[PDB]
Design an enzyme around this catalytic site. Structure first.
Site, PDB file in Angstrom:
ATOM      1  N   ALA D  56      11.158  42.844  11.016  1.00  0.00           N
ATOM      2  CA  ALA D  56      11.880  41.757  11.667  1.00  0.00           C
ATOM      3  C   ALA D  56      13.311  41.678  11.161  1.00  0.00           C
ATOM      4  O   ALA D  56      14.256  41.511  11.940  1.00  0.00           O
ATOM      5  CB  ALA D  56      11.148  40.435  11.438  1.00  0.00           C
ATOM      6  N   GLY D  57      13.487  41.798   9.846  1.00  0.00           N
ATOM      7  CA  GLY D  57      14.830  41.832   9.298  1.00  0.00           C
ATOM      8  C   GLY D  57      15.630  43.016   9.804  1.00  0.00           C
ATOM      9  O   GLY D  57      16.809  42.884  10.138  1.00  0.00           O
ATOM     10  N   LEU D  59      15.309  44.305  12.578  1.00  0.00           N
ATOM     11  CA  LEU D  59      15.348  44.283  14.036  1.00  0.00           C
ATOM     12  C   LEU D  59      16.543  43.494  14.557  1.00  0.00           C
ATOM     13  O   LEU D  59      17.335  44.003  15.359  1.00  0.00           O
ATOM     14  CB  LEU D  59      14.046  43.694  14.577  1.00  0.00           C
ATOM     15  CG  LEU D  59      13.903  43.597  16.095  1.00  0.00           C
ATOM     16  CD1 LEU D  59      12.503  44.012  16.505  1.00  0.00           C
ATOM     17  CD2 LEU D  59      14.217  42.199  16.597  1.00  0.00           C
ATOM     18  N   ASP D  60      16.690  42.250  14.114  1.00  0.00           N
ATOM     19  CA  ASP D  60      17.574  41.290  14.764  1.00  0.00           C
ATOM     20  C   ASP D  60      19.049  41.502  14.449  1.00  0.00           C
ATOM     21  O   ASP D  60      19.856  40.617  14.755  1.00  0.00           O
ATOM     22  CB  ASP D  60      17.175  39.870  14.364  1.00  0.00           C
ATOM     23  CG  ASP D  60      16.989  39.722  12.867  1.00  0.00           C
ATOM     24  OD1 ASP D  60      17.060  40.747  12.156  1.00  0.00           O
ATOM     25  OD2 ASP D  60      16.775  38.584  12.400  1.00  0.00           O
ATOM     26  N   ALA D  61      19.421  42.629  13.845  1.00  0.00           N
ATOM     27  CA  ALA D  61      20.786  42.810  13.368  1.00  0.00           C
ATOM     28  C   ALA D  61      21.822  42.736  14.483  1.00  0.00           C
ATOM     29  O   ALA D  61      22.570  41.759  14.569  1.00  0.00           O
ATOM     30  CB  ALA D  61      20.909  44.150  12.642  1.00  0.00           C
TER      31      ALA D  61
END
Lengths: 277, 48, 51, 80, 69, 50, 80, 79, 79, 80, 79, 80, 79, 80, 80
Positions: D56-57, D59-61
């Protein structure tokens, strides 16, 4: 109000109070490469981190742990376990730097929970006693270190370390030589488009973008959260501020997640730079 | 056990395995071994 | 105005600490206490062991 | 001038909108498979959760970086 | 139509004949079987089996674990 | 925002300090739990001695 | 000014619209897998439900953020 | 004058994207829901209740957008 | 003048997005429904009832937008 | 009125355009599972075709409605 | 003046589309990764190495869009 | 009036474009399952092959309607 | 004047759509790749070989578009 | 008339673009299941390839039509 | 005249962009199933790879044609 609100949105996002050599404090218009007054307050938060760890460090005892040293033991063992089970091969103070960066970014992010205006408006007292009121009302005070320069300097150091372990291959030519996403494109005008530009774009994108991605990802989190908090502050009379409490709960959730992701991906990248041959 | 059967006469159809084939094969093998033991005991009873 | 806005933010931290106790404090406290218990048992076993 | 401000507003809106659209589907795609995995191996919940959060970390960059420049344009914009 | 159903245990054969339908609980879940089915094989939960004759009479057989083919 | 290279300069410098300067008190800390495990394994061997 | 008003209205509409579109697909993608998982292991309903809430909270953050800027624009808009 | 048309089209977008999202989402959910209930028919009430729960969790943001669209329709700002 | 064209565009968007959403949603529902009823032919009526329940729950928001579109067509504001 | 005519033409086109786009994907998604199911249970083909006709008739209602509005625009339109 | 707004629009597109692509690609990869690890838990590190190779190969072009967008924002041609 | 001509050109192009895009996706979605099924049950190839044309003829109805209006606009266009 | 802005838009589209395509493509390719390698952990090398072959085959058109975009950025026609 | 030429160019581009976009995705979706089918039943390659040619020729019909209209606009367009 | 130039530029960009988007999706969709097929039965690797090349060579045709028209607009454009 409306004029006051617009002035406030002028106030809180003032960059590091922008001090300047050969000049006064700031005029909100200088916008030159000059002094900054925020990461000093960030170091004022890192120092308590070092002191807190030094408290346990000087007390070297194998006895039954009390609550505080038990919690610090949890933290150290957890970060050690993550570094160990995930990553291996060679060790030069890797876990120490990892545990430092984890806690340091976590504490920096933690400060956001305070209200938007309590600290600056209590600072109206120090404005009243020294340096006047209006200079405080142009740009004087700063919030926790959410400005992009902090995280940029943070990430570029990791990039430097990536370079330092990426020259461990004993040769710059050996390291630079790498496999490409574009080994071949037979067509001749396609080859014209390929040879110089596409390969230059590849060598640009392969490594350079990653620390920028890290810094900007952390910056987005900090800046979006703080701006949400300022924006919530309107229409106070008939409300319980239900727009704030659950949102700040989610903010508590995302703080540790962001710190964890930063630490984990940094160790990932160091491990990749430490890949054999 | 006569594994040469159903290679020349095999057809182009397979089953539709509700579980993954590995677990199904294990479950088949255990029961097959148990049945071999049982029908080896019965023959001993007849011999007795 | 300004102070009146901060009055609502006073309600905020009140509810934050209220929810912090009931939800966040028991798990952390239990983890600390339990790890202390296993450490104490492990050392006491060693004590009677040396005896 | 007026048109420039309007276009700035539009660009800022797109910056937020496409990022939200991306993340809202990415997290769903991840979480569904996570639920399938945890259902099949209920004893591996913590390490699976750690692997999740790593994903998740990572991913959202890009979208939520674009969100930052969007807010930048909202309040402190160039071109004026 | 009708199709040949054989229910055989490890000891002897229990049930046999021609049936029009079958109901069983596979590993994934319940299954409905009709003639011309695609080939398939599961593991049966310890539950009863229901078979529907052409006349409408329905025999039920109790099975505790096994393989359906 | 604004570049203001002063911020990133101080960030890198004080980061390298506050990390390398205080890697050592942490390096102290790894040993205590490990030797506690030593104690809790030796008290396990004592019963075999019995 | 008129054109600016229209364009900012468009931007506001986009902000809520794309977020709603994203969250609608995300929740469906998560929930389908959730319902499949709970049926396979009916005993694990509470912990799976808790994990689903965790994912749901992690998911709709950015669209909820965009709703805020949309409301800001509709009520207290810049560029005036 | 040109403002009013832009207001109308913005209001239309508000409702339209929400409807497009909800239609696909409900189908995606119901597919697995029906597939699940056929597998285990004895669990129908509990699964149905969970489906109501998550459906209520789903359509929140589109319903929020619908209200804003309607506010644009009847009594809008920008006048 | 131009306002009228913008209203026309908005009305078209309202109907078109709803149709696009419904077409995908019903197909996604139907695929799983047919697969399920194929696996367990006996439970066809109960699954069929579950269909209409979920489909009436689904098609709401696009149907809401359809009314708004028709309203803009016949008796529109902004004039 | 010229620009009004052009915009009306655009609206009329997009009306049936989105409808065709939706129907083409929907029928394909339905038919894939339909063929797979009839392969799995070759005996139920008439019943499956009955259900498929039912759901297909239930599906394309809104696109067909949109086509009506499009045709109305094409021949006898408002805004004159 | 118009050129400035158009460049702003182009820049917004540059970051936004690559962002939308990454946000879906990473989810699609991570789902299969989570299934793979849960099935063979003792093989986690090798799978992680393969996965990060994939991610490094993947995120390239969106970074390229982001870089050009940032170049446009600060030091753009066409002036 | 030139503007109207351009807009009608755009609308006509959209008419064919969206229909083609939809049909291309739908046919692939159907054919994948069709091939998988015929792999599963090669015996029933003619029956499946009949069903597939049945639904395909049922599929392209709306897009072919749009293509007709699209061609109608090209040669004999209204609004002139 | 408007030519510059429109060229900027075109260049932005060229990069954006290619990035959007590549991000989805590598993501869904790598997911399947991880699924496959988990099934046959020993068969990793030739799997990576085939995957790299098809990946190199994949980016052709996006790379073509990126080059044209940069060509527009630096030395565009129409001036 | 200049805007007419520009919009004609835009429309012609859209015609080819959407058709290519549809065909590229459709062929991949088909070929995936095709590869699964050919692997599972290696003895069955020729007749499955024949089926795939049948459905592929059935697929790109409408996009090919759109390419024709695009070329029509390119070489000799109406509205002049 | 400037508007014509800009619109030609936009049309050219669309031509290559949509084709690239389609090809990137299709190639990956084919490749996933290709990897499954080759992994399940590694013995058949050359035959399957040949079939995949056949499919790919049948795939990119229309986008490749579109790229040519785009570059044609780039260098030697009509309408001038």
């Amino acid at each position: 109000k409306h004029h006051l609100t617009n002035m406030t949105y002028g106030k809180m996002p003032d960059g590091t109070w922008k001090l300047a050599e050969t000049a006064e404090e700031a005029h909100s218009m200088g916008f030159t490469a000059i002094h900054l007054d925020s990461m000093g307050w960030s170091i004022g938060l890192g120092v308590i981190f070092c002191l807190l760890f030094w408290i346990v460090a000087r007390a070297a005892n194998a006895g039954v742990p009390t609550k505080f040293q038990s919690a610090i033991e949890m933290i150290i063992e957890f970060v050690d376990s993550s570094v160990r089970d995930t990553f291996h091969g060679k060790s030069r103070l890797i876990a120490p730097l990892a545990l430092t960066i984890f806690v340091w970014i976590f504490l920096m992010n933690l400060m956001d929970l305070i209200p938007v205006d309590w600290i600056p408006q209590v600072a109206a007292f120090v404005g009243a006693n020294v340096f006047g009121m209006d200079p405080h009302h142009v740009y004087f005070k700063i919030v926790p270190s959410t400005d992009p320069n902090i995280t940029l300097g943070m990430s570029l150091s990791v990039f430097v370390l990536i370079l330092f372990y990426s020259i461990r291959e004993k040769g710059v030519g050996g390291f630079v030589g790498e496999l490409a996403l574009n080994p071949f494109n037979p067509s001749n005008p396609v080859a014209k488009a390929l040879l110089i530009p596409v390969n230059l774009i590849l060598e640009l994108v392969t490594f350079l973008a990653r620390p920028i991605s890290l810094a900007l990802r952390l910056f987005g989190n900090m800046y979006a959260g703080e701006l949400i908090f300022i924006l919530i502050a309107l229409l106070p009379f008939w409300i319980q501020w239900a727009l704030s409490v659950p949102w700040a709960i989610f903010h508590i959730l995302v703080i540790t997640l962001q710190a964890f992701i930063f630490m984990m991906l940094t160790i990932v990248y160091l491990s990749m730079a430490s890949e054999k041959h | 056990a006569e594994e040469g059967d159903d290679l020349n006469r095999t057809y182009g159809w397979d089953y539709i395995y509700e579980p993954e084939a590995e677990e199904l094969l294990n479950g088949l093998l255990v029961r097959y071994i148990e049945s071999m033991v049982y029908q080896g005991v019965i023959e001993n009873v007849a011999c007795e | 105005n300004i102070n009146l806005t901060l009055i609502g933010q006073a309600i905020a931290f009140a509810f934050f600490v209220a929810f912090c106790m009931k939800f966040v404090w028991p798990p952390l406290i239990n983890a600390i206490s339990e790890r202390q218990r296993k450490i104490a048992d492990g050392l006491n076993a060693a004590e009677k062991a040396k005896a | 001038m007026e048109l420039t401000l309007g276009l700035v507003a539009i660009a800022s809106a797109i910056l937020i909108a496409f990022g939200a659209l991306g993340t809202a589907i990415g997290f769903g795609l991840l979480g569904g498979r996570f639920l399938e995995a945890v259902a099949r191996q209920p004893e591996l919940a913590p390490q699976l959760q750690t692997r999740m959060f790593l994903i998740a970390g990572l991913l959202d960059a890009v979208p939520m970086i674009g969100v930052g420049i969007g807010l930048f344009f909202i309040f402190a914009n160039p071109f004026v | 139509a009708t199709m040949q159903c054989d229910v055989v245990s490890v000891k002897e054969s229990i049930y046999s004949g021609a049936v029009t339908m079958l109901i069983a609980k596979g590993a994934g879940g319940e299954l409905g079987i009709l003639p011309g089915h695609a080939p398939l094989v599961t593991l049966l939960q310890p539950g009863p089996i229901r078979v529907l004759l052409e006349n409408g009479t329905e025999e039920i057989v109790y099975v505790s674990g096994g393989v359906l083919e």
